[PDB]
Amino acid sequence: PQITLWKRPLVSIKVGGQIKEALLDTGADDTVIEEIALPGRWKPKMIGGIGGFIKVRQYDQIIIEICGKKAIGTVLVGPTPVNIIGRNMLTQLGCTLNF
Amino acid sequence: PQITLWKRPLVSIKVGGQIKEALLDTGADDTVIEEIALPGRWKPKMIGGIGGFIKVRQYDQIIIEICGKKAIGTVLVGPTPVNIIGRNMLTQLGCTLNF
């Protein structure tokens, strides 16, 4: 499909057995989600954007459904203002910018 | 052009008579550039990132050029780690998300 940007590119996603709303974010290197329960062991990580850095937990090989597609990859969990689908996942979806 | 997301979608832009590197950011509502000299009056504004809010100067009716295409709109000037081209400008360039 083709998503215009006249409004926020928000989509429904399934992760951690839960349905959530997330932002398709080309400006994000990684994918970070609000506090949620994920399986397996995690490693610490610092991610920075406007306003500085935040500490998140990194879980790997996590399954995520986005726009009727499945992606399996790294998912960060922490105090992010909004759920963010970053490039690590967007590439799995075969997403590209066009203009 | 069609831009893949394996790496950050950086592009050269023309703004304030200067040439700069900026990131095509679908998750960004606004366009924010590091300290740069812009003409006209400005208004103060607070914008929030994953790390918190930063204070910026809001300029309106600013023209930017990207890959031969031009757009006019609001440009925020402040301490941003990276220059960001947001949706308010991406729409004007006819930039879409495709997969």
Ligand SMILES: CC(C)(C)NC(=O)[C@@H]1CN(Cc2cccnc2)CCN1C[C@@H](O)C[C@@H](Cc1ccccc1)C(=O)N[C@H]1c2ccccc2C[C@H]1O
């Ligand atoms: C207008 C402004 C630019 C202030 N907007 C944002 O920062 C929004 C904020 N919302 C949230 C919000 C905050 C307050 C109010 N409403 C909404 C979440 C989504 N971001 C957009 C991000 O894509 C911005 C980038 C900027 C950046 C890129 C590369 C290097 C440094 C900074 C961003 O924060 N990306 C980072 C990022 C993001 C997620 C996971 C990993 C990483 C690493 C890094 O790529």
Ligand SMILES: [Cl-]
């Ligand atoms: Cl990944």
Ligand SMILES: [Cl-]
């Ligand atoms: Cl605008």
Ligand code: NA
């Ligand atoms: Na990016």
